[PDB]
Amino acid sequence: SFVEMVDNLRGKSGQGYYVEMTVGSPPQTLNILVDTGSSNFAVGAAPHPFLHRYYQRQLSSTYRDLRKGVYVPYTQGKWEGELGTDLVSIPHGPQVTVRANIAAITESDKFFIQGSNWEGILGLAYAEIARPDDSLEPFFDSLVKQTHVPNLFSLQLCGAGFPLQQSEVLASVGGSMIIGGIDHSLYTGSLWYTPIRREWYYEVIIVRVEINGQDLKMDCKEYNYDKSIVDSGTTNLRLPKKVFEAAVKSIKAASSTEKFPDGFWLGEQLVCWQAGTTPWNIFPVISLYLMGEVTQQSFRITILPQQYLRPVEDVATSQDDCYKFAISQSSTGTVMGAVIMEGFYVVFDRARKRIGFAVSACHVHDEFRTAAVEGPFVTLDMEDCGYN
Ligand SMILES: CN(C(=O)CCN1Cc2cc(C(=O)c3ccccc3)ccc2N=C1N)C1CCCCC1
């Protein structure tokens, strides 16, 4: 179907997924992180201890200067840049060349990650959350208007399998970003769609949460406290303070046969099990019910411990499989990160203002269980879950 784009993503979920791209004339190649969490196409345009390479504007005959600066701070950090434009392409993507807005990053604190292997970020969200403002057209918006590529893209993040490293990056590809299409070889079963509440972040509405079938039983509005978005840039599944606690307890209980340190459930410290003996069956499956496109109808996606327990290279890299509990609390609402996406083929159907989920043909699981997507359900009381 889209053989060309299949498996065009790499990196490390923990350090983000990225795709190859080229900017300027002649072509300058750079790894760009795929982030559904933002709307700026920003690349390193100056040396930095963590950049193997960067965008060299003086060497591009098509580069154009907008003579406008941009300051973006975030978490005790920030990236500063100079706005401009140039021609862009995606080798393992559509065979097209567009002209996009490019923030040439010139100074940054806490942005570029050591080891990730990407020198830039491709924000696929809407302009509403673009810096310095919504007038700076996002990349995909430009791509869709300068070509005939369909206004939609889908993602299948396969998180590989076992612990990887900066070296294992260019050895085992991570996943796929299919631009302008939906690839039938990336999923099994049906594709279920949930509406996009507001086009700024990819915001959705969750109506119910379950732990091994048991209802978390909270006012559905609490689940979307502030907001709920899907973000390929975020590693963990992030949930409000309350929901978070309620969940850890339920998860704690479910797994009682064995006890772990409070440090584990805080993401502070990890756990290990003699190679090959990880007791998956002891940990519970998790499920989020989403609002359906059809009124009063809803469906659910379900992940396994193989999705929320991230494999990490042991401290002493011994012969023991250790794991990190990838479920943490949030204050900015729910973030459906990689622990969620690595279970499904996710479709960002902007043209129809919806997002679809399907079982990933590459998700991790043992023969006893499997991730799922099932519907329809009728648990009256849904739009009422939307926060304001
Ligand atoms: C925190 N990260 C996330 O992916 C979670 C949600 N975000 C935040 C985010 C922040 C930025 C920045 O402007 C920035 C500035 C200085 C230092 C760090 C970040 C840009 C895009 C963002 N998109 C998200 N998905 C980080 C995960 C690694 C990639 C950077 C964002």
| Probe residue for ligand 1, chosen from 17, 18, 32, 35 as the CB with the greatest number of ligand atoms within 8 Å | 35
Dihedral sign, Cα of residue 149, residue 150, residue 151, residue 155:
negative
For strand 320-325 and strand 271-274, is the pairing parallel, antiparallel, or unpaired? antiparallel
Give the residue whose CA is nearest to atom 5 of ligand 1: 234
Strands laid side by side in the 187-195 sheet: 175-179, 153-157, 344-349, 354-360, 187-195
Q: Residues 86, 141, 231, 349: which is the catalytic one?
A: 231
Instruction: Spell out the domain ranges in the chain.
Output: 17-149, 150-388
Q: Residues 35, 86, 141, 183: which is the catalytic one?
A: 35
CA of 354 to the centre of ligand 1 (A): 24
Known catalytic residue at 86: no
Question: CB of 110 closer than 6 A to ligand 1?
Answer: yes
CA of 234 to the centre of ligand 1 (A): 8
Tokens 């003699």 belong to 274
CA of 285 to the centre of ligand 1 (A): 28
Domain 17-149 identical in fold to domain 150-388: yes
* Residue 377 neighbours by CB distance under 10 Å: 15
Atom from ligand 1 closest to the CA of residue 42: 20
**Secondary structure class of 244 (helix, strand, coil):** helix
Name the residue among 358, 322, 363 with its Cα closest to residue 343: 363
Question: CB of 233 closer than 6 A to ligand 1?
Answer: yes
SS (H, E, C) 9-52: EEEEHHHEEEEEEEECCCCEEEEEEEECCCCCEEEECCCCCCCC
* Residue 319 neighbours by CB distance under 10 Å: 10
Question: CB of 349 closer than 6 A to ligand 1?
Answer: no
- Determine phi and psi for 385, rounding to 5 degrees: -85, -15
Known catalytic residue at 219: no
Phi/psi-derived region of residue 248, left when phi > 0, alpha when psi is between -120 and 50, beta in every other case = alpha
Tokens 């941009």 belong to 70
State how far the Cα of 18 lies from the Cα of 33, in Å rounded to an integer. Answer: 4
State how far the Cα of 200 lies from the Cα of 202, in Å rounded to an integer. Answer: 6
Residue 166, C-beta contacts closer than 8 angstroms, at least 6 positions apart: 115, 117
State how far the Cα of 192 lies from the Cα of 203, in Å rounded to an integer. Answer: 16
Question: CB of 129 closer than 6 A to ligand 1?
Answer: no
Protein fold of 150-388? Cathepsin D, subunit A; domain 1 (2.40.70)
* Token pair for 183: 């690839």
* Token pair for 93: 């993507």
Dihedral sign, Cα of residue 182, residue 188, residue 190, residue 194:
negative
Question: CB of 38 closer than 6 A to ligand 1?
Answer: yes
CA of 273 to the centre of ligand 1 (A): 32
State how far the Cα of 215 lies from the Cα of 201, in Å rounded to an integer. Answer: 28
Name the residue among 333, 355, 347, 39 with its Cα closest to residue 196: 355
The alpha carbons of the chain give a radius of gyration, in whole angstroms, of 21
Cβ atoms of residues 226 and 240 within 8 Å = yes
Cβ atoms of residues 381 and 207 within 8 Å = yes
Cβ atoms of residues 204 and 52 within 8 Å = no
Atom from ligand 1 closest to the CA of residue 78: 16
Atom from ligand 1 closest to the CA of residue 15: 28
Give residue 288's identity as a one-letter amino acid code.
Answer: L
Supply the CATH classification number for the domain 17-149. 2.40.70.10
Cβ atoms of residues 222 and 207 within 8 Å = no
